[PDB]
Amino acid sequence: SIDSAVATYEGFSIRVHKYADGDANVQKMRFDLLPAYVCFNPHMGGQFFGNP
Amino acid sequence: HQFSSLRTPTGDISGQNKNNLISGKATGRVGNYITVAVEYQQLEEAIKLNQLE
Amino acid sequence: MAETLEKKHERIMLRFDRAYSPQKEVREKCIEATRFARVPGGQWEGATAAG
Amino acid sequence: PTSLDVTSMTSWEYNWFGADVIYIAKYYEVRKESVDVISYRHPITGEIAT
C-alpha cells in the first residue's frame, strides 16, 4: 500500500511508486517498465538495401 | 524538461544516482524606437508646400 | 476525406481492433460458461489429456 | 493534445488492457449575480408581468 499508480501512453502501462525519507525530509518517485522479447523464426525478416 | 533512464538486471537503483531537475528559461526584451520626423518653416508651408498629405 | 474505398477499409479495421480490445475477456467467460453448461464434454476442458 | 485528470483512485487491484480512455469533467457553480428585471404593465389580458 505504497502510493502507487499506473500511467498510460499509447497502449503502454507504467507503474509509479512514491516513497520518502522521513529523517531528511526528501520525497522521491520511480517509474518502472519490464519488457520481453522473442524471435520466432529468423527466416521471416532481415535488412534490405538498394542494390547497384 | 528531459530525463534519462537506468537499465538494471533486477531493478536496483540504491547504489546509483537519480535525475536532477534543472530549469531553464528564454527571455524576450524590448528593442528601440522606430521614429521618423520632419520639419518645415511657416513661410515655406505658406508659399511652396502644397499637397502635404 | 478518403475518397477511395481502400482508405475507408483500414479505418474500419482500426475501429474493429479498438472495439475488440477491451471486450475480450468477458466474452471469453460467456463462451466458457455456455460450453460448460451445454457441450456434453465441456466440463473437463483444459485438462482433456492428463496422465 | 489530449490530457486527462489525475485521481489515482483505480488500478487498485485490477489489471489493465484498455489504454484508450481520457477523463473529462463537467464543473458546476452557483453564483449571485446582479440582473435587471423588466416589468411589462399592459392592462390587456392581465397587467402585472415581470
Side-chain angles (χ1 to χ4, degrees):
Chain A
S1 77
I2 290 178
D3 299 321
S4 86
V6 296
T8 300
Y9 190 78
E10 292 82 3
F12 287 75
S13 67
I14 291 130
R15 178 154 287 273
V16 17
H17 282 298
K18 311 184 180 67
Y19 58 111
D21 188 6
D23 300 71
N25 261 16
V26 166
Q27 308 208 184
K28 353 167 73 75
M29 293 195 192
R30 55 178 304 165
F31 295 83
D32 274 350
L33 189 140
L34 181 42
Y37 305 109
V38 65
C39 185
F40 296 127
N41 197 353
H43 299 158
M44 302 187 195
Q47 300 175 357
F48 82 99
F49 290 107
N51 57 3
Chain B
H1 287 46
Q2 299 177 0
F3 304 89
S4 73
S5 74
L6 275 299
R7 303 228 80 210
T8 49
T10 177
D12 291 331
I13 48 184
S14 76
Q16 284 106 313
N17 44 45
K18 286 98 167 167
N19 301 265
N20 307 299
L21 294 172
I22 296 93
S23 293
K25 67 180 157 56
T27 81
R29 34 175 50 80
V30 71
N32 315 327
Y33 273 71
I34 303 179
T35 178
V36 56
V38 308
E39 76 191 14
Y40 48 94
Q41 316 187 20
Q42 203 193 10
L43 61 83
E44 294 294 328
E45 71 76 22
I47 55 187
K48 292 183 184 293
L49 277 296
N50 49 2
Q51 307 196 185
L52 185 83
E53 294 292 328
Chain C
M1 161 294 288
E3 183 73 24
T4 63
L5 278 300
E6 307 280 20
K7 285 204 215 73
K8 298 292 190 186
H9 193 261
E10 75 268 14
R11 288 180 63 189
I12 288 170
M13 292 337 276
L14 283 181
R15 285 177 172 179
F16 179 98
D17 291 331
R18 253 180 60 202
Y20 174 76
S21 170
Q23 283 302 159
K24 174 152 41 53
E25 298 87 349
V26 180
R27 314 283 192 110
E28 280 205 332
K29 279 299 290 196
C30 302
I31 294 164
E32 186 206 313
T34 58
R35 192 162 257 281
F36 188 90
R38 299 307 200 192
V39 172
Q43 301 207 326
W44 275 97
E45 279 181 7
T48 311
Chain D
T2 62
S3 185
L4 73 165
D5 290 331
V6 298
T7 177
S8 302
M9 170 75 47
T10 49
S11 193
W12 176 52
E13 276 79 61
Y14 174 52
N15 185 349
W16 290 108
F17 44 79
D20 293 358
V21 299
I22 304 162
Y23 294 106
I24 301 306
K26 293 186 300 295
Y27 163 99
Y28 290 91
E29 281 215 78
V30 59
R31 301 204 259 279
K32 283 267 218 184
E33 294 207 317
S34 66
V35 291
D36 211 3
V37 294
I38 315 302
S39 164
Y40 281 29
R41 217 212 63 78
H42 59 87
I44 298 96
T45 58
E47 64 183 1
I48 308 306
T50 310

